[PDB]
Every structure is written in structure tokens, then in C-alpha cells.
Design an enzyme around this catalytic site. Structure first.
Site, mmCIF file in Angstrom:
data_model
loop_
_atom_site.group_PDB
_atom_site.id
_atom_site.type_symbol
_atom_site.label_atom_id
_atom_site.label_comp_id
_atom_site.label_asym_id
_atom_site.label_seq_id
_atom_site.Cartn_x
_atom_site.Cartn_y
_atom_site.Cartn_z
ATOM 1 C CB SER A 97 2.445 -14.797 42.226
ATOM 2 O OG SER A 97 2.468 -16.061 41.724
ATOM 3 C CG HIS A 137 3.904 -9.913 35.091
ATOM 4 N ND1 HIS A 137 3.878 -10.583 36.317
ATOM 5 C CD2 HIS A 137 4.853 -11.245 34.177
ATOM 6 C CE1 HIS A 137 4.661 -11.170 36.165
ATOM 7 N NE2 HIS A 137 5.389 -12.082 36.404
ATOM 8 C CB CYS A 140 7.345 -13.774 37.705
ATOM 9 S SG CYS A 140 7.238 -14.844 36.239
ATOM 10 C CG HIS A 187 1.524 -9.061 39.291
ATOM 11 N ND1 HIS A 187 1.766 -9.990 38.833
ATOM 12 C CD2 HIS A 187 1.173 -9.344 39.798
ATOM 13 C CE1 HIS A 187 1.729 -11.376 39.077
ATOM 14 N NE2 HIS A 187 0.578 -11.128 40.582
ATOM 15 C CD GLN A 217 -2.297 -16.069 41.444
ATOM 16 O OE1 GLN A 217 -2.503 -15.794 42.214
ATOM 17 N NE2 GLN A 217 -1.203 -16.537 41.119
HETATM 18 C C1 LIG Z 1 -0.772 -13.942 37.938
HETATM 19 C C2 LIG Z 1 0.500 -14.264 37.553
HETATM 20 C C3 LIG Z 1 0.599 -14.218 36.649
HETATM 21 C C4 LIG Z 1 2.113 -14.403 35.824
HETATM 22 C C5 LIG Z 1 3.177 -14.403 35.853
HETATM 23 C C6 LIG Z 1 2.900 -14.878 37.558
HETATM 24 C C7 LIG Z 1 4.383 -15.804 38.688
HETATM 25 C C8 LIG Z 1 4.165 -17.100 38.656
HETATM 26 C C9 LIG Z 1 5.224 -17.575 39.867
HETATM 27 O O1 LIG Z 1 5.173 -16.759 40.719
HETATM 28 P P1 LIG Z 1 4.233 -18.147 41.730
HETATM 29 O O2 LIG Z 1 3.692 -19.521 41.093
HETATM 30 O O3 LIG Z 1 6.533 -18.628 42.223
HETATM 31 O O4 LIG Z 1 3.786 -16.888 42.868
HETATM 32 N N1 LIG Z 1 4.642 -17.292 37.382
HETATM 33 C C10 LIG Z 1 4.303 -18.424 36.543
HETATM 34 O O5 LIG Z 1 3.233 -18.345 36.581
HETATM 35 C C11 LIG Z 1 4.985 -18.028 34.910
HETATM 36 C C12 LIG Z 1 5.565 -17.833 34.613
HETATM 37 C C13 LIG Z 1 6.244 -17.845 33.203
HETATM 38 C C14 LIG Z 1 7.361 -17.556 31.955
HETATM 39 C C15 LIG Z 1 7.343 -17.379 31.172
HETATM 40 C C16 LIG Z 1 6.186 -17.193 30.069
HETATM 41 C C17 LIG Z 1 5.032 -17.926 31.504
HETATM 42 C C18 LIG Z 1 4.945 -17.701 32.012
HETATM 43 S S1 LIG Z 1 3.569 -17.954 33.637
HETATM 44 C C19 LIG Z 1 1.309 -14.542 38.418
#
Ligand SMILES: Cc1cccc(C[C@H](COP(=O)([O-])[O-])NC(=O)c2cc3ccccc3s2)c1
EC number: 5.2.1.8
Length: 113
Positions: free
Chosen positions: A104, A9, A63, A107, A81
Site C-alpha cells: 500500500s 498508523h 489511509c 507507514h 500485509q
Molecule cells: C498494511 C496496511 C495496514 C493498514 C492500512 C493499510 C491501507 C489500506 C488501504 O490502502 P490500499 O488498500 O488502498 O492500498 N487500508 C486498510 O486496509 C484499512 C483501513 C481502515 C480504516 C479504518 C479501520 C480499519 C482499517 S484497515 C494497509
């Protein structure tokens, strides 16, 4: 529907995001209107061929998965989420979402497996 899907993403945060900071910017100052403009800009460049999804995410995704060129690996329902989860599981492998909104930020999602 498969047990899990694999997606990459590209996240664009805004100042009203749940956590307005990222690896690439100490304080997210852009407005949510500006964040969606960027996302739609990215969508149209990827549709035209002018930009590659994974290169864009490695440079501009707020991210930390940007270090993985956007790849999040595999995940099941119940972990992400819910708006993100729903868009991901609705894609075909190789297909890209439109704008997806979560606490967050905003996307675009590419299903790879
Ligand atoms: C809904 C959602 C999906 C993916 C990412 C986010 C943002 C979220 C950070 O946004 P924040 O929490 O600061 O508001 N990142 C992750 O959950 C992930 C990061 C990584 C890195 C490497 C591998 C797996 C993952 S999962 C939100």
C-alpha cells in the site's frame, strides 16, 4: 505475545503504490523517494515534540483511518500485509515504529494496546 494488538498508523502512498489514490488526493503523484522523505520528516517532528502522531495522521494519512485519527482498532496475525503485521507485533504499547514498507505504501505505526 498477545492474541491481538491495537494500533494507529500514518500511511504515505506514492505513485507506485498498489492503489495510487486516497480520500485526500484523487491521484497520488508523489515519488516513493518523496514519500519516504515525508515519513522521516514526520518521525523527527514527533520525536522533537513539534507534532502529535494522531493529529498528523488525521490530516495527512492516505489511509481512510485518518478519520479515526489513525486508529485501526485491534487485529490478529494473518489479517494485515505481513510487513505491517510484523512491525506492529514487535512494538511495545506506547511505542512508535520507524518506516514500514508495504504494497500500500509507507507507514509509521503506533501501538496503543
Ligand atoms: C498494511 C496496511 C495496514 C493498514 C492500512 C493499510 C491501507 C489500506 C488501504 O490502502 P490500499 O488498500 O488502498 O492500498 N487500508 C486498510 O486496509 C484499512 C483501513 C481502515 C480504516 C479504518 C479501520 C480499519 C482499517 S484497515 C494497509
Amino acid at each position: 505475545e498477545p492474541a491481538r494488538v491495537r494500533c494507529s498508523h500514518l500511511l504515505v502512498k506514492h505513485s507506485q503504490s498498489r492503489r495510487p489514490s486516497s480520500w485526500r488526493q484523487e491521484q497520488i503523484t508523489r515519488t516513493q523517494e518523496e514519500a519516504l522523505e515525508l515519513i522521516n520528516g514526520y518521525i523527527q517532528k514527533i520525536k522533537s515534540g513539534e507534532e502529535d502522531f494522531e493529529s498528523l495522521a488525521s490530516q495527512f494519512s492516505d489511509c481512510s483511518s485518518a478519520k479515526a485519527r489513525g486508529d485501526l482498532g485491534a487485529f490478529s496475525r494473518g489479517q494485515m500485509q505481513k510487513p505491517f503485521e510484523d512491525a506492529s507485533f514487535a512494538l511495545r504499547t506506547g511505542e512508535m515504529s520507524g518506516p514500514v514498507f508495504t504494497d500500500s505504501g509507507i507507514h509509521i505505526i503506533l501501538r496503543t494496546e
